[PDB]
């Protein structure tokens, strides 16, 4: 039911092409590292294509805009956070622009669930967040959960029914562990199933 998907040829192929793009992006300059986190303060309570369209639209002005002008562009962009989460950008930029990979990777290299904690010092960035942005960046170790991936996990039979009434950091790396097992027989890391599991839901490779 899962193992076909992470066989069929069309859906490898894409998966691959991302990963080699996160790989990529793990050599790559500050202004990447801060475009990833920026796509990943964008993606919260959104979906994937909300996100990029807000990104594209903004394109280079994330690194220079203020924050009303990058709210008028989000606003235009039809992303409808545009209000909190241009003052997000903004305050990210401000406490971690030209410094970002600088800290963040020694830290991943030796410790990824270590460097997900600092990054929660970010305003805008949660458990989820910070897991999803670090996986764009090259560290595969770390699941990006919240209770969309519960149920689907409930779905595929992976666990059961469950009334998730607060999403601790725990319980947040105990619903990883259990990804990671199946990813692990799968054949792969847990931030790539992500992009299975997305795949099988939208029909898209998403990021």
Same mark, same amino acid.
């Given at each position: ?6 066989? @069929?040829? %069309?859906?490898?192929? =894409? ?9 990529? @992006?793990?050599? /790559?300059?500050? !202004? ?20 990029? &369209? ?16 990058? =709210? ?21 930029? !401000?406490?971690?622009?030209? =410094?970002?990979?600088? +800290? ?5 290299? +030796?410790?990824? &669930?270590?460097?997900? +904690?600092?990054?929660? @010092? ?5 458990? &989820? !967040?910070?897991?999803?942005?670090? =996986? ?24 059961? +029914? ?6 601790? %950091? ?5 619903? !990883? ?6 990813? /692990?027989?799968?054949?792969? /890391? ?9 795949? %099988? ?7």
């Amino acid at each position: 039911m899962l193992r076909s998907l992470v066989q @069929n040829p %069309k859906v490898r192929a =894409r998966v691959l092409e991302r990963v080699d793009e996160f790989r990529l @992006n793990n050599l /790559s300059n500050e !202004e990447v590292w801060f475009r990833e986190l920026t796509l990943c303060l964008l993606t919260a309570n959104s979906s994937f294509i909300s996100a990029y &369209q807000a990104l594209n639209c903004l394109g280079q002005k994330i690194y220079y805009a203020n924050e009303e002008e990058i =709210r008028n562009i989000l606003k235009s962009c039809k992303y409808r956070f545009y209000n909190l989460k241009a003052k997000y950008i903004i305050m990210a930029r !401000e406490k971690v622009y030209g =410094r970002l990979k600088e +800290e963040i990777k020694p830290l991943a290299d +030796e410790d990824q &669930q270590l460097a997900r +904690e600092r990054l929660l @010092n970010i305003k805008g960035i949660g458990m &989820q !967040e910070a897991s999803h942005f670090l =996986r764009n960046v090259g560290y595969f170790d770390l699941a990006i959960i919240d209770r969309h991936i519960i149920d689907f996990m409930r779905r595929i039979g992976a666990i059961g +029914e469950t009334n998730v009434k607060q999403l601790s %950091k725990s319980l947040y790396i105990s619903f !990883e562990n259990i990804l990671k097992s199946i990813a /692990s027989n799968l054949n792969m /890391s847990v931030g790539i199933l992500d992009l299975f599991i997305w795949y %099988k839901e939208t029909n898209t490779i998403v990021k």
